């Protein structure tokens, strides 16, 4: 019966297989290069590279968050006392007065002598929190009669083009500093040689990440979400002011308590997991928004003084924005230290594979080099159209940054892109290994990938990185094509 059915079945039913060649791999997402579209805006919850933390030398032990922000503003009082608003840039649908009144209410509330960090439920706080904006539920019998009521057409994400602030975020978040931010607790004593190898490996692996920028940005997200979730359940009906805290240690070993800004908690009677609590962020910065205005259409910027940053004077700005989070995303923020393991495992695999080849701990060799071997070098990025060799440390941080950006911009566009693009990745590896790969409906692969490139910065920049990487592989394929033959 099988063979008798296959005889009478139409020839049109087939897989239409075609062997994959490199010119069949057209760059993914043709619309991201089109200038007719608007460039993708910064949409993270907090600032990352542009942040500016007000330092404060302390004993190095926990204090109350209000008292910390008070003593930080005590040190840098020139900015705290600035009640004169110098507005630089303004979000389309924002209210200069309300926002600045809010900032002053936060500053003064935190600066006061009393315990509570609660904020008065004002008319400007009710706008920035979005009070009463929920719609009223009514009976089905009424809505059926009311002919003005209709099913809303759904909001579809906008089609954004490539923006260079992502590239610069990546470039800067991956670089080293002099400030360690991680809060890694203690462990048991080492006994077995494996534990002494691991402990010795951590000195190279961990401090490579700890000293870089992305480590402090991550710890900022974690500790903030940790307290932002606590207020969201403890003080539900109460509007509260929460500081953007993070303790830091410099290379000399002195505990600096950093304050990157102040945030307003909304009304948080969060029943379902996806229920939203709107949060309003007031964050310090050194970046002039007029430089990259396409980056900040969601932000409202003031100018509230100046500081001696790197010896010279630098203008301090206040980036104000109405934002939002939910129970889920606050939890995933508390579980965001795991961005270490995903990048530390990936590179310890390369250290263990290299130790297999040469039969001794190749950690120091990979990072620094040694008597026998040179340091491990990777293709790290481009520079005026040619490759650049970065060290093992940099390749470690680049993955750690990529793992942090997977969270900070984590949504359905990322999942759909990563998954469907990973297929087109594997095919390229088969072409690199010359395993004669065949495809059945390549337009289906592209249609499945390209629908996920809308308005996620990390997706749009990864699609650009993917096409630059795909371009450089095509120049290497000119080596293998004429081998032997």
């Amino acid at each position: 019966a099988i063979e008798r059915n296959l005889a009478r079945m139409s020839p049109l039913v087939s897989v239409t297989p075609k062997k994959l060649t490199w010119e069949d791999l057209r760059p993914i997402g043709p619309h991201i290069y089109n200038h007719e579209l608007p460039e993708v805006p910064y949409n993270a919850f907090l600032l990352m590279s542009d942040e500016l933390g007000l330092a404060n030398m302390t004993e190095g032990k926990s204090k109350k968050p209000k008292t910390l922000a008070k003593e930080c503003l005590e040190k840098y009082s020139t900015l705290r006392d600035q009640t004169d608003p110098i507005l630089i840039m303004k979000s389309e649908k924002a209210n200069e007065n309300f926002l600045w009144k809010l900032w002053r209410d936060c500053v003064n509330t935190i600066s006061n002598e009393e315990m509570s960090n609660e904020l008065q439920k004002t008319n400007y706080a009710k706008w920035a929190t979005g009070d009463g904006l929920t719609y009223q539920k009514i009976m089905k019998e009424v809505a059926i009669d009311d002919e003005t009521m209709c099913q809303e057409e759904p909001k579809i994400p906008n089609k954004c083009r490539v923006a260079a602030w992502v590239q610069t975020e990546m470039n800067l978040l991956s670089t080293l500093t002099s400030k360690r931010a991680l809060d890694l607790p203690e462990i048991g004593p080492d006994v077995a040689p494996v534990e002494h190898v691991g402990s010795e490996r951590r000195k190279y692996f961990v401090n490579e990440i700890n000293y870089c920028k992305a480590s402090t940005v991550m710890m900022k997200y974690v500790l903030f979400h940790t307290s932002l979730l606590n207020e969201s359940n403890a003080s539900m009906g109460k509007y509260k002011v929460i500081p953007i805290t993070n303790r830091v240690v410099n290379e000399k070993g002195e505990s600096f308590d950093m304050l990157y800004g102040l945030a307003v908690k909304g009304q948080s009677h969060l029943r379902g997991d996806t229920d939203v609590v709107t949060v309003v962020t007031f964050e310090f910065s050194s970046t002039d928004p007029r430089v990259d205005s396409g980056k900040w259409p969601k932000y409202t910027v003031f100018r509230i003084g100046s500081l001696f940053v790197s010896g010279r004077e630098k203008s301090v700005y206040l980036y104000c924005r109405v934002n939002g989070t939910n129970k889920i995303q606050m939890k995933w923020g508390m579980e965001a230290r795991r961005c270490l393991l995903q990048s530390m495992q990936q590179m310890e695999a390369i250290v263990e594979q290299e130790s297999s080849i040469q039969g001794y701990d190749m950690t120091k060799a990979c990072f620094k080099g040694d008597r026998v071997n040179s340091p491990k070098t990777f293709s790290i990025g481009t520079q005026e159209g040619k490759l650049v060799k970065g060290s093992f440390g940099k390749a470690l941080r680049v993955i750690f940054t990529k793992c942090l950006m997977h969270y900070v911009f984590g949504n359905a566009q990322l999942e759909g892109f990563s998954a469907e693009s990973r297929r087109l990745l594997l095919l390229i590896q088969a072409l690199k290994d010359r395993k004669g790969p065949w495809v059945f409906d390549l337009e289906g692969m592209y249609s499945g990938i390209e629908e996920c490139i809308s308005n996620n910065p990390w997706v749009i920049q990864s699609a650009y990185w993917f096409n630059e990487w795909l371009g450089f592989e095509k120049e290497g394929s000119k080596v293998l094509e004429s081998v032997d033959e």
């Binding site: 670089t175 080293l176 500093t177 000195k203 490579e208 290379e251 440390g393």
Partner: peptide
Amino acid sequence: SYSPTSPSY
């Protein structure tokens, strides 16, 4: 004791 470095710092 490890102190990482780079050609941009």
